[PDB]
Amino acid sequence: QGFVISNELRQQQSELTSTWDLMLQTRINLSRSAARMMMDASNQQSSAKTDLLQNAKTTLAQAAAHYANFKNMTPLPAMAEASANVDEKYQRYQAALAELIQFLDNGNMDAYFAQPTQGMQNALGEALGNYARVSENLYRQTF
Amino acid sequence: GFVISNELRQQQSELTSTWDLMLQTRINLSRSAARMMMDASNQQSSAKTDLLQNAKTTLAQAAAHYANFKNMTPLPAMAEASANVDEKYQRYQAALAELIQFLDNGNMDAYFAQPTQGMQNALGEALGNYARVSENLYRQTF
Ligand SMILES: N[C@@H](CC(=O)O)C(=O)O
Ligand SMILES: N[C@@H](CC(=O)O)C(=O)O
């Protein structure tokens, strides 16, 4: 520990980082799945793969595993605002990604491309970037 | 308060940003190639050329962050060990840049055939190894 339980803040950032990266690979997988889905316009797309969609399911499960860990460890009262905003945000992005797997799972390319996914993602990154600031800024104080 | 721990955190944020932007580049490229398969009226929604262009941009910013990282160094043995991160980054960056020209030149065969995921994994580990060595090994050793 030390700097306001430095190790703690170090572990939470590790969990959030892995959760974040894992949600990004989930989106990559969906996308690679979608691009390969041959059912568009004047083109046969590419090697029809649903394994990639299955992968998406797995990575989202893994990201959910890490967040579950971030949520069950020594919660600091000062990080209460930052942590909740991280929750307004994670639940929305995780639900966005699942609306997507559900669309690719039923051939609903109507809804898949139309979903404003990037906005949901940015909002989480903002929340995550904010958690990082709070954990250091004026939080590195007292030692 | 130490020069070592402080420069280690600074480097962690530069790498995190690089990694994120390279992941963001891959996502932008993929969304373009998907939109490139049907080409259903390119516009605000079907921002295919626009996603290809954003991919060029996020990759350029990744490059910049790495610049800051390589533009500094006080740690001895660490760097020696972590020439691994540079190798893996050198590799993955070229992979992303090549996918941009394949997509740009409409070479879909080449875009899908490239073993991108293998190169990104290699980098993610190099990064996790950097953190392994930074943590304790230096975070305690000064
Ligand atoms: N809207 C979805 C699918 C797509 O546009 O390719 C996304 O942002 O991933
Ligand atoms: N090989 C490229 C394109 C694709 O396979 O979707 C990638 O893995 O990003």
Task: Give a three-class secondary structure readout of chain B.
Answer: CCHHHHHHHHHHHHHHHHHHHHHHHHHHHHHHHHHHHHCCCCCCCCCHHHHHHHHHHHHHHHHHHHHHHHCCCCCCHHHHHCHHHHHHHHHHHHHHHHHHHHHHCCCHHHHHHCCHHHHHHHHHHHHHHHHHHHCCCCCCCC
The amino acid that residue B50 corresponds to is D
For B115, phi then psi, to 5°, come to: -80, 60
- Rounded-to-integer distance, Cα A28 and Cα B102, Å: 18
Whether the CB of B124 is below 8 Å from some CB of chain A: the reply is: yes
State which approach was used to obtain the coordinates. Answer: X-ray
Residue B82's φ and ψ, nearest 5 degrees, are -70, 35
**Size (chain A), residues:** 143
Chain B touched by A13 (CB under 8 Å): no
DSSP A141: -
Other CB atoms within 10 A of residue B31 CB? 26
- Which of helix, strand or coil describes residue A38? coil
Please give the number of the atom of ligand 1 that sits closest to the Cα of A118: 8
**Side chain identity at A55, as an amino acid letter?**
N
Superfamily of domain A1-143: Aspartate receptor, ligand-binding domain (1.20.120.30)
Please count the other Cβ atoms lying within 10 Å of the Cβ belonging to residue A118: 15
- Residue pair A131/A15 in contact (Cβ under 8 Å)? The answer is no
Asked if residues A2 and A143 have their Cβ atoms less than 8 Å apart, the reply is yes
DSSP letter at A115 equals S
CA distances from B104 to A36, A119, B4, B31, B61 (A): 18, 26, 43, 14, 19
- Residue whose tokens read 């909002």: A123
Within 13 Å and on the Cβ side, how many CA atoms surround B67? 7
Residues of chain A contacting B16 with CB distance shorter than 8 Å: 17
CATH number of B1-142: 1.20.120.30
Is residue B51 within 8 Å of B37, Cβ to Cβ?
Answer: no
Q: Map residue A21 onto helix, strand or coil.
A: helix
Interface of B with A in 89-118 (CB under 8 A): 108, 112
Q: What is the resolution of this structure in A?
A: 2.2
For residues A54 and B48, the answer to whether their CB atoms sit within 8 Å is: no
Report d(CA A54, CA A104) in Å as an integer: 10
Is residue B23 within 8 Å of A17, Cβ to Cβ?
A: no
- Are A133 and B9 a contacting pair, CB within 8 Å? no
Ligand 2 pocket at CB < 6 A: A 32, 35; B 26, 30, 99, 111-112, 114, 116-117
Do the chains contact at A40 and B38, CB–CB below 8 Å? Answer: yes
What single DSSP character describes residue A78?
G
- Tell me the one-letter amino acid at B55: A
Q: Please tell me if residue B64 touches chain A, with a CB cutoff of 8 Å.
A: no
Contact A85, A130 (CB under 8 A): yes
